[PDB]
């Protein structure tokens, strides 16, 4: 008699396909219909401090990422002082403070190799 | 011509099938019940953590972040 | 100032009498670097600070002006210890580092792996 | 071992109609923006679309169904992010499903269903391995779904609708 | 916290007892005074060792304060000790004891297979035993008396094999593992045995890292399996096991936190005690070659 | 709290578990078999053969009982039942944790 | 089943009666007794690991059962004094012996098991 | 059965609706930061422009299937198709053409291409030949039959994703019983196997070739009752 | 809800001797009233004897021989 796109049966047929047939009607489901609510508010509250611990170590130790994927390109990072001067002076400036910035480092090299002995 | 061929072993792959019993069937649908069993990433919602993560770290860049040194390498 | 990595600020070297009173570790005793670490852990004492805050702060916020020599003496001292300020430049040019040779005796024997043939 | 063979079917002359959306009852994409109801639904189905694209849930917001007992098929209308789409589909193989079948077959968190999803009414076809969701708001015909071809008397088997999908 | 060989010796047998009565808690069976007896011999045979060598330390210097050895026993490192037929080397032998007794207690490769057994006992016991408290007896006494093994050949040699062996060993058993405290028991030998490579590099300071790290998250994971089991009516196999993250959702999620921080997994706390192992690593050992693969097969 | 008088121990009913319950839930299993044709003929006085069980379907339904029930069921338990009268009865009685 | 395999010193042929068969003697059975008892073993064996196992596949496990109905029903069709018989029960022992898992789980209601006698009951005396 | 109701301080399902995150119930209302309440609400997104963007800017309706009868293009002007892969073949297409992208590109982009080659070996060689590779090999897109041939025209798809096709005559096509080659390949089928049927496998006796069929692919019943193939 | 009754007194089940405690096996047995058991437990029995146990371990750990030397030639070479 009944058939199929019935709102009766297919609503039967949800609530009884996972059925225990094993168990009276009426009390023949299986599934659990809701989640320990102080359990689940603690075990959340536990897995937000481990997922923030995780993204701090992430955030301020990148040594696992440098040594397992390499350097990505760096965000830009700059100051606009220069900009306070204009013209020859701020061409020759820039000049001058771009050759210091060579000299600091063949220094720091120079600085590293030579000083070895420093220690007696 | 009298070869076993696609269709012969398709139709013996069915009976084989229907050879089989629904009683193991029956008394195990209970186990795959999709209203009591999810996935791990389902579960593990990231969504509002992700959330307090960021308010964190804000305040870490604007309480300690001023105070680091760049270290390129 | 102009002093070496190892020497301090004030250019004063302590004596084993002002080590054992501001007990230094054997760890840091064993190196060079006793003279910068001893301002530096004064600094601490007078100004006592949380983990987390030492951990957080780049500068080590108040004993940053200790912290510079200090940093600067662990870092050359490492470096000697190691050897990777040559270790690195042979990495970098093993060719023009054994046409010029910095150190025979790491060049000798050093093998870049197979792996990274850059 | 079920196979996936073809039986080559064809519509007949007069079908009947059994679902027919309330909503959407124009002819047409444009009928739709036009019409108030229809423009509003659209845009609530729209995560539903982006569920079917990225999220490869193969699933299909149907109205307008027709069915033809010559044959034995039913033509369903489906209402896609581009338009209306005319499918065949053969009643061997639809099978029921429950909701949360529908909802745990896709391996990513679904948004929030609008509450014009009819939950109870969602199908299976098997065959194509995907899902028809009908429209709350919408209007059967007794006297179509009532046809013989269409009783489980006939169209009932247990191993197919209860063992077919184990989601798992 | 002892101050003098003797009570060290002590602490040493009453752990000794009092781990064999939480053994053999269940009393009434006889199948679990079988593992308590298993544990109480390997127990007495370490009692053994550490009395041997507590007797050659008085021997050679009439002294049992542990300061006192640590600070004299580069005088007498010189000396030899005349037994049956060989000549052997006073710290060699004092170390070989000190060595043999904390290997047995610490349940390195050879002298581990009591504490498999010793799942028996109640979880609480077993996580207590198997975190901080009886599996790293050898490690203190190790850490203690630290300046006696720096001037041990024998030590060199072993530590690190043993370590690396027993390290390998236990992990992979215990990724084979199929029963909850199995497991745990497998990676606590497998944790103890990069204990005792660590400890062969000789950074005191990643020695106590990685021990507390182990300890910690060792513990809160037998805790979690432990609700587990009780939920699943004292079955701890996991077979039959599944579907319990709704069921205990706490415990899920507690587990997962405190299994990658265990297990050493990129970006956790676990991460760093292994990689500081593997800086510390020494490379002038002959058997340099299976200790670094066992090192790495037991890491992964 | 136990009286400080002498209590002794208290056989109630000699079922650990709801005997009814029990034999519905068996006859079900039961019914839920291929072989078996008629659940209405099966009665807690009906022997297998007559239900319909063979010896070989008699350890399949077996084995699905003790998966329901919680309980390992011996051999030789499982070879003197005659009836289901006598599986209920020893189901019930059983003590699930031996 | 007193679930006693791994305790008393048994041998390996008789621990493979015991898991075959519920008695240490499978002579003394009878064909049906033989018969039944190995089928249950099988089944049990292959619900243990194929059903409550590592990633189990249910549709591997139903194969699998019913090969080994359609077998059994053969096996006890066939009269006991058959090589062919014989032959089956060979390959079913060595598929016991196969699947044999060392600290294989032991129900908590039988004998002998993990927490059987954790408590001593006081008689009325 | 439930006696929440009896207590005033008991839960209710207003506690619970925070688990709708973690728990899968059917729609009870919608907030005001969903999806389709923002779409609904916002009317920036009726705008026609929006509307024809959504329409036209995305997977198209032709190419969704209309029927549960395909009849594919045929390969040959006298052939027949008989089976055809849906899911698995687009699968293993898209996989095998990742060797045209990632491949030059971890050359082209890598800082040690040999470090990423002397990874790839063992990996390839374990948990990916068996799992994928070999499958895919075997694998049969489609399957035509060539009457006055009496042939049987194979699809596959090759290195970089390239489809060839290759003739088989219907004299040398066998069936090699499930049993025979399991214990062989065991670990092809134990982690790779799973989407190909396994016991439909039928092998090339002079060229000592297989043919793996999708569990998910369709076949054709005109195909399958032709009497070359019968 | 059923009334259950008191423990049974059949969870500890009266183990009656059936066979001579030989005195070559001596503290053997670990003697009980209930489950008397050997004083050790062979759960890989499966094994007949220790040298066959030897036998299939060694056998078995060819493998984990080989994992070990290709580990160690991939970090040798790199
Ligand atoms: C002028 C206007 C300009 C507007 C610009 C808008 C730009 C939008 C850019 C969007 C970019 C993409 C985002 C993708 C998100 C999802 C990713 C994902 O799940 O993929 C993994 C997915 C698997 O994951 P899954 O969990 O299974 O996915 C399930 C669902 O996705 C279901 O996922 P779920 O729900 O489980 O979680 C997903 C979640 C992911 O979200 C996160 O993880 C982010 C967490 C927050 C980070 C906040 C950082 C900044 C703030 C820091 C803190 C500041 C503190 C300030 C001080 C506070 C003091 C108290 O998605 C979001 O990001 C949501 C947006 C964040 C809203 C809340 C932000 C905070 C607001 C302020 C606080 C108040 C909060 C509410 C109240 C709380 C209680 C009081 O893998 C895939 O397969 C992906 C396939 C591709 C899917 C694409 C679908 C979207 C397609 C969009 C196409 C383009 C449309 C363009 C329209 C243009 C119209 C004009
Ligand atoms: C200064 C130079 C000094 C040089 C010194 C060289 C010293 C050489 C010593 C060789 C000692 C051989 C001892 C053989 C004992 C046999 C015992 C017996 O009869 O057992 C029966 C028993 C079978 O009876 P069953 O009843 O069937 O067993 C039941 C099982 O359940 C059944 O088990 P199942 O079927 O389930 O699986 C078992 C599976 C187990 O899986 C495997 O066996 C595969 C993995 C094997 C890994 C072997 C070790 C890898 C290398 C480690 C080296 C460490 C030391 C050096 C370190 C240097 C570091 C710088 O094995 C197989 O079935 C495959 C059979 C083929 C295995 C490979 C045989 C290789 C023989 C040697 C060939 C050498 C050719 C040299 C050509 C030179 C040309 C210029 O045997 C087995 O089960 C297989 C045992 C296989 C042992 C292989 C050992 C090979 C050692 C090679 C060392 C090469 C060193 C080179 C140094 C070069 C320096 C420059
Ligand atoms: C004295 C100084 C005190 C400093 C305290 C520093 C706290 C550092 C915390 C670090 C992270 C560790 C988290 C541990 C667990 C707690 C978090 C948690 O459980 O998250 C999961 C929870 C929920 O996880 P969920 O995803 O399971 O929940 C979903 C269900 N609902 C929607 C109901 C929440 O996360 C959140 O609720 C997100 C919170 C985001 C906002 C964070 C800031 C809140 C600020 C409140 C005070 C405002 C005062 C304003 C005063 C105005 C005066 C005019
Ligand atoms: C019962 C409740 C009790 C109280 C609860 C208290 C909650 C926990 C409070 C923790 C406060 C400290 C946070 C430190 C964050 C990490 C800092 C860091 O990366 O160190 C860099 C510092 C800065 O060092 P540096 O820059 O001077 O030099 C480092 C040297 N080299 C470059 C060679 C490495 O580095 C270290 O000292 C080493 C740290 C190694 C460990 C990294 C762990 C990352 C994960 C952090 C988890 C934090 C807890 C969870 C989230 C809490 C959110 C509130
Ligand atoms: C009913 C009462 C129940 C008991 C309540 C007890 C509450 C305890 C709350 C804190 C516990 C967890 C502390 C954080 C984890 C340890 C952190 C650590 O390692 O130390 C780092 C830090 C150490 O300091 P630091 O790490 O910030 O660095 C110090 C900096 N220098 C070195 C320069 C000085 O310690 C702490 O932060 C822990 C708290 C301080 C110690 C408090 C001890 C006294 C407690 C007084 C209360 C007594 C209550 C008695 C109740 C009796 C009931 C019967
Ligand atoms: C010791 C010796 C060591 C040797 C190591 C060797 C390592 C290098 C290996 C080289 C592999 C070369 C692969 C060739 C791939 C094509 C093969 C083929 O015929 O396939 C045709 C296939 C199939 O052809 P078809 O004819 O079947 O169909 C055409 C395409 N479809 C299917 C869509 C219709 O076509 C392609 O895949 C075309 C790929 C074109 C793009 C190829 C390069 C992409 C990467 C560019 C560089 C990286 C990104 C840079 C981004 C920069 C941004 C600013
Ligand atoms: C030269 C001959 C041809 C070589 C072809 C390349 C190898 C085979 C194809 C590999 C495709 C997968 C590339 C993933 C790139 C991920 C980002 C990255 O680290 O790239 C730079 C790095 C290398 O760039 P690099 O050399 O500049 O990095 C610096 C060097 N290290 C990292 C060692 C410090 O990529 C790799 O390391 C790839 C290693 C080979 C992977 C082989 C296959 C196993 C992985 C399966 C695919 C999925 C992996 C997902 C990984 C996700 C993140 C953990
Ligand atoms: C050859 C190159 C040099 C390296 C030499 C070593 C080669 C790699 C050796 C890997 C051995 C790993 C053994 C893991 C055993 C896990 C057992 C377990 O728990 O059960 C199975 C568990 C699954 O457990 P389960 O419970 O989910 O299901 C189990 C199902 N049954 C029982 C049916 C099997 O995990 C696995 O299955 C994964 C292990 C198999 C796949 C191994 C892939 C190895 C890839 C190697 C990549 C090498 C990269 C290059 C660099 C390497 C050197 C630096
Ligand atoms: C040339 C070859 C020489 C070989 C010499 C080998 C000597 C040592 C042999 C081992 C046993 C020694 C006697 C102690 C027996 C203890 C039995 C016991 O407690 O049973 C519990 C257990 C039995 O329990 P079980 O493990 O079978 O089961 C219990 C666990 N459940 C409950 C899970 C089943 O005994 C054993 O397993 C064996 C214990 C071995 C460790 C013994 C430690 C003491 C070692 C003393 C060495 C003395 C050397 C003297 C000089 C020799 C000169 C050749
Ligand atoms: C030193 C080599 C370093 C690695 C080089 C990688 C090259 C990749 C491009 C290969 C192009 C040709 C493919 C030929 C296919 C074929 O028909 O191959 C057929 C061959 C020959 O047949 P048989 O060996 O089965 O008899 O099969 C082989 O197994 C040998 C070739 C193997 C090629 C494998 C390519 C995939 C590598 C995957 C790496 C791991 C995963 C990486 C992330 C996705």
């Given at each position: 008699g009944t058939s199929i796109f019935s709102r009766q049966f297919k609503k039967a047929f949800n609530d009884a396909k996972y059925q225990n047939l094993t168990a009276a009607q009426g009390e023949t489901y299986s599934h659990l219909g809701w989640i320990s609510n102080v359990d689940l508010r603690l075990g959340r509250a536990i897995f937000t401090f481990g997922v923030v611990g995780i993204a701090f170590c992430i955030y301020l130790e990148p040594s696992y990422f440098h040594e397992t994927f390499g350097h990505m390109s760096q965000p830009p990072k700059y100051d606009l002082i220069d900009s306070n001067i204009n013209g020859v002076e701020k061409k020759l400036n820039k000049q001058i403070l771009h050759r210091e910035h060579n000299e600091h480092k063949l220094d720091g090299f120079v600085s590293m190799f030579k000083g070895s002995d420093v220690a007696k | 011509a009298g070869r076993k061929l696609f269709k012969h072993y398709i139709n013996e792959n069915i009976k084989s099938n229907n050879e089989q019993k629904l009683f193991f069937y029956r008394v195990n649908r209970w186990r795959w019940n999709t209203k009591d069993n999810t996935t791990a990433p389902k579960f593990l919602r990231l969504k509002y953590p992700l959330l307090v993560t960021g308010v964190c770290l804000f305040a870490y860049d604007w309480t300690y972040g001023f105070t680091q040194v760049d270290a390129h390498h | 100032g102009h002093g070496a990595w190892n020497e301090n600020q004030q250019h004063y070297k302590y004596s084993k009498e002002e080590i054992e009173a501001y007990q230094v570790p054997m760890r840091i005793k064993a190196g060079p670097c006793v003279d910068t670490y001893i301002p530096l852990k004064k600094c601490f004492q007078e100004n006592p600070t949380s983990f987390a805050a030492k951990m957080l702060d780049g500068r080590k916020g108040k004993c940053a002006k200790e912290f510079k020599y200090y940093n600067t003496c662990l870092n050359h001292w490492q470096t000697y210890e190691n050897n990777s300020h040559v270790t690195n430049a042979y990495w970098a040019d093993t060719s023009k580092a054994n046409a010029d040779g910095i150190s025979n005796t790491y060049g000798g024997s050093f093998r870049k792996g197979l792996a990274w043939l850059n | 071992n079920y196979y996936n063979i073809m039986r080559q079917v064809s519509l007949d002359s007069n079908p009947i109609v059994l679902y027919q959306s309330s909503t959407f009852t124009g002819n047409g994409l444009q009928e739709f923006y036009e019409n108030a109801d229809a423009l509003t639904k659209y845009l609530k189905l729209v995560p539903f679309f982006l569920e079917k694209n990225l999220y490869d849930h193969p699933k299909q917001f149907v109205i307008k169904m027709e069915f033809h007992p010559q044959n034995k098929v039913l033509s369903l209308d489906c209402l896609t992010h581009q338009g209306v789409l005319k499918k065949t589909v053969n009643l061997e193989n639809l099978i029921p499903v429950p909701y949360e079948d529908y909802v745990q077959f896709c391996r990513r968190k679904l948004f929030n269903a609008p509450l014009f999803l009819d939950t109870e009414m969602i199908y299976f076809n098997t065959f194509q391995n995907e899902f028809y969701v009908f429209d709350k708001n919408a209007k059967w015909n007794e006297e179509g779904i009532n046809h013989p071809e269409l009783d489980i008397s006939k169209l009932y088997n247990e191993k197919a609708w209860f063992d077919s999908l184990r989601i798992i | 916290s002892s101050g003098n060989f003797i009570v060290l010796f002590l602490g040493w047998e009453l752990i000794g007892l009092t781990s064999f009565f939480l053994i053999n808690f269940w009393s009434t069976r006889v199948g679990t005074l079988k593992a308590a007896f298993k544990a109480f011999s390997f127990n007495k045979l370490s009692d053994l060792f550490l009395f041997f060598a507590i007797l050659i330390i008085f021997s050679t210097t009439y002294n049992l304060d542990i300061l006192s050895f640590n600070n004299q026993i580069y005088l007498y490192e010189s000396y030899n000790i005349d037994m049956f037929y060989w000549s052997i080397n006073l710290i060699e032998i004092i170390s070989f004891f000190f060595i043999s007794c904390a290997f047995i207690k610490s349940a390195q490769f050879g002298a581990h297979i009591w504490l498999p057994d010793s799942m028996e006992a109640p979880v609480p016991a077993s996580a207590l035993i198997h975190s901080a408290?009886?599996?790293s007896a050898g490690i203190y006494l190790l850490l203690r008396l630290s300046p006696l093994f720096e001037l041990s050949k024998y030590a060199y040699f072993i530590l690190p094999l043993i370590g690396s062996v027993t390290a390998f060993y236990g992990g992979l058993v215990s990724a084979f593992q199929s029963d909850t405290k199995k497991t745990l028991a497998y990676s606590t030998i497998s944790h103890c045995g990069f204990l005792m490579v660590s400890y062969s590099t000789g950074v005191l300071e990643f020695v106590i890292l990685y021990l507390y790290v182990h300890g910690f998250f060792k513990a809160a994971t037998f805790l979690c399996v432990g609700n587990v089991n009780r939920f699943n009516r004292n079955i701890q196999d996991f077979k039959r096991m599944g579907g319990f993250y709704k069921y205990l959702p706490f415990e899920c999620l507690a587990s997962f936190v405190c299994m990658i921080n265990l297990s050493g997994l990129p970006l956790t706390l676990g991460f760093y005690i292994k990689h500081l192992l593997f800086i510390g690593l020494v490379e002038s050992y002959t058997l340099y070659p299976l200790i670094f693969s066992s090192l790495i097969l037991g890491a992964i | 709290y136990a009286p400080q008088k002498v209590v002794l121990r208290n056989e109630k009913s000699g079922y650990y578990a709801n005997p009814d319950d029990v034999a519905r839930r068996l006859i079900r299993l039961i019914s839920?078999?291929?072989?078996?044709?008629?659940?209405?003929?099966?009665?807690?006085?009906?022997?297998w053969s007559e239900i319909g069980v063979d010896p070989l379907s008699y350890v399949e339904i077996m084995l699905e009982a003790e998966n329901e029930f919680y309980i390992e069921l011996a051999d030789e338990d499982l070879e003197r039942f005659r009836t289901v009268e006598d599986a209920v009865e020893f189901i019930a009685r059983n003590f699930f944790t031996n | 089943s007193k679930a006693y395999y791994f305790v008393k010193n048994f041998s390996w042929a008789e621990v493979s009666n015991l898991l075959c068969?519920?008695?240490?003697?499978?002579?003394?059975?009878n064909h049906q007794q033989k018969v039944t008892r190995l089928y249950r073993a099988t089944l049990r064996r292959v619900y243990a690991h194929q059903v409550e196992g590592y990633k189990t596949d249910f549709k591997q496990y139903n194969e699998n059962i019913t090969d080994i109905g359609k077998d059994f029903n053969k096996m006890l069709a066939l009269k006991p004094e058959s090589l062919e018989l014989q032959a089956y029960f060979k390959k079913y022992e060595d598929l016991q012996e196969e699947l044999f898992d060392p600290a294989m789980i032991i129900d908590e209601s039988r004998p002998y098991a993990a927490s059987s006698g954790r408590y001593y009951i006081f008689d009325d005396y | 059965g439930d006696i929440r109701h009896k207590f005033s301080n008991e839960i209710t399902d207003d506690d619970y609706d925070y688990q709708r995150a973690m728990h899968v119930k059917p729609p009870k209302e919608e907030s005001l930061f969903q999806l389709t309440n923002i779409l609904s609400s916002?009317?920036?997104?009726?705008?026609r422009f929006f509307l024809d963007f959504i329409a036209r800017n995305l997977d198209t309706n032709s190419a969704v299937s209309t029927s549960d009868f395909v009849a594919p293009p045929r390969v040959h002007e006298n052939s027949f198709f008989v089976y055809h892969s849906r899911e698995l073949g687009n699968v293993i297409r898209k996989y095998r053409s990742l060797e045209s992208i990632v491949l030059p590109g971890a050359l082209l982009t890598f800082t040690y291409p040999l470090f990423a080659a002397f990874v790839a070996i063992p990996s390839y060689y374990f948990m990916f030949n068996a799992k994928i590779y070999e499958m895919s090999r075997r694998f049969v897109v489609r399957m035509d039959v060539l009457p006055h041939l009496e042939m049987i025209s194979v699809q596959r798809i090759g290195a970089f994703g390239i489809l060839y096709t290759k003739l088989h005559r219907i004299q040398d096509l066998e069936y090699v019983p499930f049993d025979q080659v399991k214990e062989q390949e065991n670990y092809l089928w134990a982690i790779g196997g799973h989407g190909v049927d396994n016991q439909l496998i039928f092998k090339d006796r002079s060229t000592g070739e297989f043919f793996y069929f999708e569990r998910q692919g369709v076949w054709d019943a005109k195909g399958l009752n032709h009497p070359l193939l019968n | 809800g059923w009334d259950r009754?008191?423990?049974?007194?059949?969870?500890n089940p009266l183990y009656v001797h059936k066979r001579e405690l030989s005195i070559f096996d001596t503290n053997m047995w670990m003697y009980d009233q209930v489950y008397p058991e050997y004083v050790i437990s062979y759960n890989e029995i499966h094994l007949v004897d220790q040298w066959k146990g030897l036998k299939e371990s060694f056998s078995q750990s060819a493998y984990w021989w080989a994992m070990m030397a290709m580990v160690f030639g991939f970090y040798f070479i790199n």
């Open positions: - | - | - | - | 408290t009886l599996v | 839920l078999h291929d072989k078996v044709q008629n659940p209405s003929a099966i009665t807690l006085k009906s022997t | 068969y519920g008695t240490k003697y499978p002579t003394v059975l | 916002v009317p920036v997104f009726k705008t | 009754p008191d423990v049974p007194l059949s969870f």
